[PDB]
Structure 1
Amino acid sequence: GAMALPSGSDPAFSQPKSVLDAGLTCQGASPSSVSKPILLVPGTGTTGPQSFDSNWIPLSAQLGYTPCWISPPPFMLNDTQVNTEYMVNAITTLYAGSGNNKLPVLTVCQGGLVAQWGLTFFPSIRSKVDRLMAFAPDYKGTVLAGPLDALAGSAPSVWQQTTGSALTTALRNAGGLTQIVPTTNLYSATDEIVQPQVSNSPLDSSYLFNGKNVQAQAVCGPLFVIDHAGSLTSQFSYVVGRSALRSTTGQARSADYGITDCNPLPANDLTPEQKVAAAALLAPYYAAIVAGPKQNCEPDLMPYARPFAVGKRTCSGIVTP
C-alpha cells in the first residue's frame, strides 16, 4: 500500500528557538532532563494550565508521567502554524531530554489540529511522538465559526479553524487526515464548539483515517450528552485516555472501555476540588473574552503547506502552484 506525506528536512521556524522554549513548562522538572514526559497541547483561547490544571495535569501525574505543556501566546489565538512551532520544538526538546525516547502527546480542541499539523509538515518528529491522545480535535475546523465570508477582524486561529479554510484544506490534501503515529480521538456528537461531529464517520471533524476514533455516542448511546469540555474531563474520557496511554498498540483498546465507563462527570480520580473545577470548566469559551491578534484575511500558508491548498484565498490572494 501507500501513504504519502511531506518529506525532507524540517521547515524553518519563524520564531527563535529561545522564544519557543519559553512557551514550554514541565511540572517539577526541566525539559532538558525529564522522566516519562507527556506533552499537553491546549485549546483555542487558553494556556496549558487553563486547559489541563483541572484534569490531565494531575491525572497524567498519577499515571506516572511528568506533565509538560506549551502555552503559545496569546492564548492559542495566533496563527495555528506558529502555535505548531511551539509543539514541534517541545517534542524535539522533550524527546532529547528523556534520553531520545518517544513520548505521548495529549490534546484538546485546537491542540490536536496543532499536533497533526506538526506531524504532517515536520518530518523529524514523526519518530519522536509515541502516540497521540486527542480530545475533541478539530482537524476539519468547525462549522460553528464563520462562515468563510463573515470573519472580519477575528483572531488568526479562528479564521484557520473555520470549515473550508485554506489551513484545514492544506492539512487534508497533504495527507494529514490519516493518522501518522498511533492516535486515539475521543469526541462527542453533542460538542457545542466543534461540529460536525454527529456521523461517527470520516465526516466528523475529529476523525482520522486508521485512528482509534471514539465518538462517545457510538459507545454510550445517542442520548448520551457530553459537551466540549466534558469530552476532555469526563470519567469516560479518562478511561479511554488511560487505555490509549498504556496500550501496547499505542491506541485505546476496545477491551479496556465500554458501557460501564459511560459517565460524563469529571474523572473519578480527581480530587473534589479538581472535579468542581473540571465540571465548571469554561476554558473553551475564553476566546470570546481575551484580546487577540487582529486579522483581516486568512493567514497565508507557510511555503511547506501552500502547494496543498491551490484555489483557496488567503491574505496574499488565491493560492496557485
Structure 2
Amino acid sequence: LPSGSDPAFSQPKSVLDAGLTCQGASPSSVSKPILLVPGTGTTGPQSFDSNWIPLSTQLGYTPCWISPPPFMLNDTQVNTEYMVNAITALYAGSGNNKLPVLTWSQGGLVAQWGLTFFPSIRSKVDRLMAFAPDYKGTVLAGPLDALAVSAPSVWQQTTGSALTTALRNAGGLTQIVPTTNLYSATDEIVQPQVSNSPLDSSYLFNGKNVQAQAVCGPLFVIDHAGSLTSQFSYVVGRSALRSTTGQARSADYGITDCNPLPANDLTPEQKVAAAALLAPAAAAIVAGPKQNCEPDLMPYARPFAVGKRTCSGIVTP
C-alpha cells in the first residue's frame, strides 16, 4: 500500500468541516462516534435518516455523517477528502479513540480509497462495515466508451474506470482495516455480485464478505437499497460493530434473520422512508453535474492507472 505522508487536500479545512455533522453533538466533542458515508446522489441524511442513524443510536453510538456536495456526484477523490478530514476530526473529538465507519454504495469505495491513499487514518478507523460497496464499480453502466454524459462519480464507478483501476493497482482490493462487506446477488445497480467469489464488486481479500444469498438461499432478494436497510443487513452490521475482531461473525446470524424488509426496530415511518431510499438519487442526477469523460486522477493516484483515459487525456507514467 501507499506509505508516507498524506496527500494534500484540494479543499480548505473549513469546507471539509462544513460537510460533517453529528447527531446532537459537535465533532470536536463526541462520544462513540460512528462515521456514515452516503451513496451516490444523496446526502448523509438522505442515505441514513431512515436506517443507520436511528439504528446506530440504539446500539450506543453517536451517528455522524458527511454530505459532500452536490449529493456525492462530484469527483470521488474529493468526496474522500471529506471522509479523511472527518475521521481525523472524530478521532480527536472522541478523545483520540478509533471509530467505526459504516457506508452505503459509493461510500464504501470512498472509505477504501481513503484508507489506501491517506495512511494517517489507518490507525484511526477501528473497522469498516460496507453495505453494497462497489470497489470494482459496476458493469451495469455499460462500457466507458458508450457511457452517456454522466456525473463525475458515475464515471468513476463505471467498471474499467481509471479510479477503480488505480484502487486495485495500489492494493485496495484487499482489506486495510477489519472490513465486512454485505451485498446481494440481486443488486440492480452494482454488478457483478452473483458469484459469491472474488469476482464480486463488493469483495475484498481477507474481508468478511457476506453475499446475502450465500446465507439466506437463492430465493432471498434485496436490492441495492435493501442491502443497507434490511433486517438481515441490520443483524450483520450489528455483528460487525460488536465483534472483537472488527468483522461480522457467522455465529451471530442465521436463517431466521433472513428478512428482506426494513429492519424491525425501525418505526413504521422509517420503514416506509427506507423502502423509498433510492428516489432522491435520481432527482440529484437530473439536476446535477454531467460530463463526457472521467475526472482526472489526482497526482497521488495517477501512477496506478497509466494508460487509462481521463478528461485531460491518457495517463502517462
Does the TM-score normalized on the shorter chain lie above 0.5?
A: yes
Q: Give the whole-Å Cα distance in 1 for the aligned partners of 2:280 and 2:127.
A: 24
2:33 to 37, 44, 63: 37
CA RMSD of aligned residues (A): 1.1
Q: Secondary structure at the match of 2:88?
A: helix
- Given that 2:106 and 2:133 are in contact with CA atoms closer than 8 Å, whether structure 1 keeps it comes out as yes
Q: How many residues align?
A: 317
Greater Cα shift, 171-180 or 308-317 = 308-317
- Given that 1:58 and 1:270 are in contact with CA atoms closer than 8 Å, whether structure 2 keeps it comes out as yes
1:237-295 residue CA offsets vs partner (Å, 9 max, x unmatched): 00000000000100000110111110001101111111121123224743664422232
1:110-132 residue CA offsets vs partner (Å, 9 max, x unmatched): 00000000000000000000000
- Given that 2:138 and 2:191 are in contact with CA atoms closer than 8 Å, whether structure 1 keeps it comes out as yes
Q: Secondary structure at the match of 1:228?
A: coil
Q: Give the whole-Å Cα distance in 2 for the aligned partners of 1:30 and 1:290.
A: 33
- Given that 1:44 and 1:287 are in contact with CA atoms closer than 8 Å, whether structure 2 keeps it comes out as no
Rate the CA distance shift 1:272–1:198 in 2: closer, same or farther, 3 A.
same
- Given that 1:147 and 1:163 are in contact with CA atoms closer than 8 Å, whether structure 2 keeps it comes out as yes
Shift >4 Å, 4+ stretches: none
1:6-58 residue CA offsets vs partner (Å, 9 max, x unmatched): 01100000000100000000000000000000000000000000000000000
TM-score, normalised on structure 1? Answer: 0.97
| Equivalent residue runs for 1:165-184 within 5 Å | 165-184=161-180
Structure 2 unaligned residues grouped into runs of 5+:
none
1:79 aligns with 2:69: no
1:146 CA displacement: 3.5
Greater Cα shift, 292-301 or 77-86 = 292-301
1:56-100 residue CA offsets vs partner (Å, 9 max, x unmatched): 000000001000000000000000000000000000000000011
Rate the CA distance shift 1:137–1:108 in 2: closer, same or farther, 3 A.
same
Identity within the alignment, % = 98
- Given that 1:46 and 1:283 are in contact with CA atoms closer than 8 Å, whether structure 2 keeps it comes out as no
- Given that 1:229 and 1:284 are in contact with CA atoms closer than 8 Å, whether structure 2 keeps it comes out as no
1:315 CA displacement: 1.4
- Given that 1:61 and 1:67 are in contact with CA atoms closer than 8 Å, whether structure 2 keeps it comes out as yes
- Given that 1:152 and 1:296 are in contact with CA atoms closer than 8 Å, whether structure 2 keeps it comes out as yes
Rate the CA distance shift 1:154–1:289 in 2: closer, same or farther, 3 A.
closer
- Given that 2:162 and 2:305 are in contact with CA atoms closer than 8 Å, whether structure 1 keeps it comes out as yes
Rate the CA distance shift 1:142–1:220 in 2: closer, same or farther, 3 A.
same
Q: Give the whole-Å Cα distance in 1 for the aligned partners of 2:39 and 2:314.
A: 29
Rate the CA distance shift 1:149–1:287 in 2: closer, same or farther, 3 A.
farther
Q: Give the whole-Å Cα distance in 1 for the aligned partners of 2:192 and 2:284.
A: 21
1:319 CA displacement: 1.4
Q: Give the whole-Å Cα distance in 2 for the aligned partners of 1:57 and 1:290.
A: 27
1:166-188 residue CA offsets vs partner (Å, 9 max, x unmatched): 00000000000000000000000
Q: Give the whole-Å Cα distance in 2 for the aligned partners of 1:195 and 1:294.
A: 22
Q: Give the whole-Å Cα distance in 2 for the aligned partners of 1:280 and 1:299.
A: 30
Q: Give the whole-Å Cα distance in 1 for the aligned partners of 2:280 and 2:164.
A: 20
Which residue in 1 is equivalent to 2:313?
A: 317
1:223-247 residue CA offsets vs partner (Å, 9 max, x unmatched): 2111111100000000000000000
TM-score, normalised on structure 2? Answer: 0.98
1:114-170 residue CA offsets vs partner (Å, 9 max, x unmatched): 000000000000000000000000000001114201234311001100001000000
- Given that 1:152 and 1:297 are in contact with CA atoms closer than 8 Å, whether structure 2 keeps it comes out as no
Q: Give the whole-Å Cα distance in 1 for the aligned partners of 2:281 and 2:75.
A: 18
1:101 aligns with 2:97: yes
- Given that 1:313 and 1:319 are in contact with CA atoms closer than 8 Å, whether structure 2 keeps it comes out as yes
1:317 CA displacement: 1.6
Q: Secondary structure at the match of 1:289?
A: helix
| Equivalent residue runs for 1:200-219 within 5 Å | 200-219=196-215
